[PDB]
Design a protein around this ligand. Sequence first.
Ligand SMILES: C[n+]1cn([C@@H]2O[C@H](COP(=O)(O)OP(=O)(O)OP(=O)(O)O)[C@@H](O)[C@H]2O)c2nc(N)[nH]c(=O)c21
Ligand SMILES: C[S@@+](CC[C@H](N)C(=O)[O-])C[C@H]1O[C@@H](n2cnc3c(N)ncnc32)[C@H](O)[C@@H]1O
Ligand SMILES: [Zn+2]
Ligand SMILES: [Zn+2]
Lengths: 301, 115
Amino acid sequence: SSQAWQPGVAMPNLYKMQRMLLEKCDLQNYGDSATLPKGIMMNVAKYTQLCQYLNTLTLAVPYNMRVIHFGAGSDKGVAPGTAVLRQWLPTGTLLVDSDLNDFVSDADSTLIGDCATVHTANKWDLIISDMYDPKTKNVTKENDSKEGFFTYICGFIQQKLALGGSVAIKITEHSWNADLYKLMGHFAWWTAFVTNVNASSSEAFLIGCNYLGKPREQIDGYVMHANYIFWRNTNPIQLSSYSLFDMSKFPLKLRGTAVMSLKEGQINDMILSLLSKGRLIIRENNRVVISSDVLVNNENL
Amino acid sequence: AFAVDAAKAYKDYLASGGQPITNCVKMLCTHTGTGQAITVTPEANMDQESFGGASCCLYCRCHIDHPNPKGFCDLKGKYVQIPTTCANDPVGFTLKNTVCTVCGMWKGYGCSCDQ
Ligand SMILES: C[n+]1cn([C@@H]2O[C@H](COP(=O)(O)OP(=O)(O)OP(=O)(O)O)[C@@H](O)[C@H]2O)c2nc(N)[nH]c(=O)c21
Ligand SMILES: C[S@@+](CC[C@H](N)C(=O)[O-])C[C@H]1O[C@@H](n2cnc3c(N)ncnc32)[C@H](O)[C@@H]1O
Ligand SMILES: [Zn+2]
Ligand SMILES: [Zn+2]
């Protein structure tokens, strides 16, 4: 009821508040495919709805914004999500992407390798991940919290996300992680957002809005994933691509958000209020430097 | 003295009835843009489709060096507007066509500097 004209659906708050146990996800439309506008790739539609939704949040959008995008490659050898991100972000925004496998990209710089090889001197204002491990399809066991690239992502956010910055991290029923849900409580607000073009999937983007560097809230990530699956199991979402057809208001508003290089003692409740509201970013404003660790081996016996 | 001529290979393959390079990345946009050929954000008008640049660059997509001596790519990081009548082969279009240095439209597909 009006839901189909949205870019997607966010986890309603009452479901966040529950104490469900984890069940199997069983979506009534599982496997159905949306009708995409002519010649539009799924991931252009999916990233477009993700960005349409982020437009409704209080993202900080500084000058010389720094964005990093993990899991940006594809079985096509190109990066449709990066292209949408570069369309959405203010022109001149620095955008770095990365993936295990080689691909051609419109990012300002691309690193190929396992994401745990990636290091950066600077902090970031927005982190996007669409990483998904294809072996996750081999469910041989209880649906336990997963480590791998999620362990990297949790560390990356704590170490290298500017206060006031935001994240959107792709999960599914089986590709999830309990510390990532716990970290959502370290943001001024958080949700799980399902795009309407992929409503037939258990995918969601876990969105953390305005990072605070400490827990606003203690979240049990095991319970919270159980709550998310419960929501999806009891709220069928109708596949929709309606919102793809209105791009008039798509670009991220360049808010000119201020950037200050404060130290941990200087973060008072008033600073924390500005962070919470999307009105401040706290990080160094130096030059962006990235690298990827390369393992060296000589195979000649 | 020897260098692969990637452009010529693709132009000939096309003429021999080969399938154009696929998976060029087409953008959602209003189609109320300026129409210029190569823009920092999608600028398709009602006659054009907008694509991610890199995915439409023959050298980017074939993992070979660019003609610019310093290796600079004209398309990567930008959006190329392609007439809807040629959007079946964005790579071929950008290879075979030229951008007017004056108005920024495709010579022969928007440029009207001769009037
Ligand atoms: C959500 N879900 C998951 N499975 C099974 O659990 C496996 C791992 O599930 P998954 O973690 O990859 O989630 P999903 O398949 O929704 O992600 P997507 O492919 O990115 O869209 C899946 O391959 C299915 O075999 C499912 N099987 C049925 N019959 N119905 C469902 O809703 C369902
Ligand atoms: C759903 S796909 C990416 C699709 C892409 N975002 C797009 O715009 O089309 C999942 C990606 O996550 C990558 N990936 C999975 N595990 C990874 C890891 N440990 N490190 C880096 N990349 C990983 C895969 O190579 C794979 O390309
Ligand atoms: Zn190129
Ligand atoms: Zn001209």
